[PDB]
Structure formats: C-alpha cells, structure tokens
C-alpha cells in the first residue's frame, strides 16, 4: 500500500504527523499489512490549487491507496470506514470533508525490494 | 469524478482559472455531472521537472481523470473529444499539445461524505 | 507512456536529469517505442512529506508509469527488470530503494493528439 494525501496546506502542515500514524493504524488494522511498511506522501497544496465544492470546507482532504489485486471486498469496505471513522474521531475531519479511493493492479504490474510482484 | 492537471508553472499559471471552469463544462456536458462538484488539483511544474518530447510546445498539458466504474464507454469517448475541442477553442492549447487519462475503479473502492462508493 | 518520478529532494534533484536517461533506455528497450516520445514528471519531495520504512535510505524513488492496455505480461517485466539493474547500475539506487508501478487502462480511456487512443 503506496498512500497519497492531498489537502490544502494551511489545513494539512499542522495534521501530517498525527494523520499520517491514524492512516497507517488503519491499514495496518483493516489489511493486517506490517507495522513497518508506512509508505505515505503528502501533498500540502494552496487554495489556487486545489479547487473543490462550495459544500466542503477547507479541512477537505483526498487519500489515495494504491495496491496489488487480492484483498476481499469485505476488507477495503472495512478499510474505508476505518479511516472515516478514526480520522474523524483522531483529527476532526469530518465525514463529507474526506474522500478515499483505493486503487488496484495485478501482482507483475509493481516492482520493489529488487524483483516483480508476482514472485 | 476527480480531476489532475499538470502543467509548466509559466503556461499554466495564467490559464487555470479558464481552464478549470472549461474542464467542468466539458465534464457536466459528456457525463450529466452536477454543475457545482468541480474537483480540480493543479500541478505547475517548473521547467526542470516537466520534460516532454520536441514534438510539443511549452503549452503542453496533461489531464488526468478518476471516476467510478460505470460509464458508457460513448460517454467516456464524448468527454474526452470535447475537452480537445473546447481547449483548443477557449484556450488556444493545440490537441498535440494536450493529453488526456481517465481511470475508473469499482464503487467500494471510494469513500465519500462517510460511506463507501455503494 | 507516462512516467511520475518520486523522491526527497536532497537525492533526485541532483540525479534526475540521468534518471531520465536510464528511464527512457529501458522503455525503449523493453516495450519498442521510439526514441522521442520521453515523457517525464519528477516531485523532488521534502523528507516531512514523503515518509517511507526505516530501512530504506534517502534514495528511495518511486517510478510511476501509465500506458494503454495492450502490452504482454513478459514486456511489463521486463520493463520492471530493465529498471532495477540500469538505475542500480548507474545510479547506485539498490533494489530495496526502487519501487516501480506500472498502471493500465482501456485505449479510449487516453487522448493525445486530438484524438481518442483507439482512434
């Protein structure tokens, strides 16, 4: 799980430590994934810059995770109200200021620690 | 559905206010989408970072689009000829200059407003 | 194809103009594609925003690439392949600091030129 989090720098400097733990407890408790492997990039951008809905406030913040293809359907739903849940609870984000998108590819499709996925 | 646009900091910086309202129209156009969910991040590269082909001018811009699975495949097809059409129009960026990307994933792989995409 | 490059800023931005050369030979090499047609965006990132395992240095890079549907399963891995030995080669970033995510979608779903991808 590669994670990307999006939202505007006022808002996001002052949270990154803290979501960045919550995010990775979540993933961790959702996809039973090592307590090592926090692979996140945070992207701090200004209101110019990341343009959304009168609807959200400034808190609006974007995660996006990126897999290999194999976890259950059960498990990402699970993962998804995770986050929701202790992100709200942990940072105050609330619900309709957070949006979370999962995204999958097959096993030879990723290369680390020297060799394709599929092996 | 979201919206990425990347772009050399000194052609972008000028053109994304229009650039955005022309991207929306073309999305609530092709996908009947609600005119007020205009999701955009802009990404003005500098110079050393953006490194394209000679084939394209300084104006070159790439847009990359995310949405759920779902859509007609003519929908798709119809957004991506009008973004071409109405930025060369509205903008001046050349359809060599302009390059496009839409990704779609299922339904429960999204959160929003604190429910899964179903 | 279209290639994102990831890295702190202390390591890719002194490296980033032989990380694209080594990039594009090994795309040339394992998918044919000419010599033009190099497309490249690096995000030479700060150590605050993109956290990455304890075992990993400071040279730990992420490769990005889209490209359309179509490409057997042996060329992605060769791609992977070609990747991990000429950047370790001439860049000395080991296999454990490279990771590589190849990403695909159907030939409408892209734009170039002025025209749909399967046109």
């Given at each position: 799980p590669q994670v990307?989090?999006?939202?505007?720098?006022?808002?996001?400097?002052?949270?990154?430590?803290?979501?960045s733990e919550?995010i990775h407890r979540?993933v961790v408790?959702?996809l039973q994934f090592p307590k090592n492997k926090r692979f996140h990039?945070?992207?701090?951008?200004?209101?110019?810059?990341?343009?959304?809905?009168?609807?959200?406030?400034?808190?609006?913040?974007?995660?996006?995770?990126?897999?290999?293809?194999?976890?259950?359907?059960?498990?990402?739903?699970?993962?998804?109200?995770?986050?929701?849940?202790?992100?709200?609870?942990?940072?105050?984000?609330?619900?309709?200021?957070?949006?979370?998108?999962?995204?999958?590819?097959?096993?030879?499709?990723?290369?680390f620690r020297?060799?394709?996925?599929?092996?």
């Open positions: 990307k989090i999006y939202g505007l720098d006022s808002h996001l400097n002052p949270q990154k430590v803290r979501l919550v979540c408790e959702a990039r945070f992207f701090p951008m200004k209101a110019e810059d990341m343009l959304f809905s009168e609807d959200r406030s400034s808190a609006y913040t974007i995660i996006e995770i990126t897999m290999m293809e194999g976890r259950s359907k059960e498990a990402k739903k699970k993962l998804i109200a995770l986050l929701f849940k202790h992100i709200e609870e942990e940072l105050g984000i609330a619900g309709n200021d957070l949006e979370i998108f999962i995204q999958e590819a097959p096993a030879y499709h990723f290369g020297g060799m394709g996925g599929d092996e």
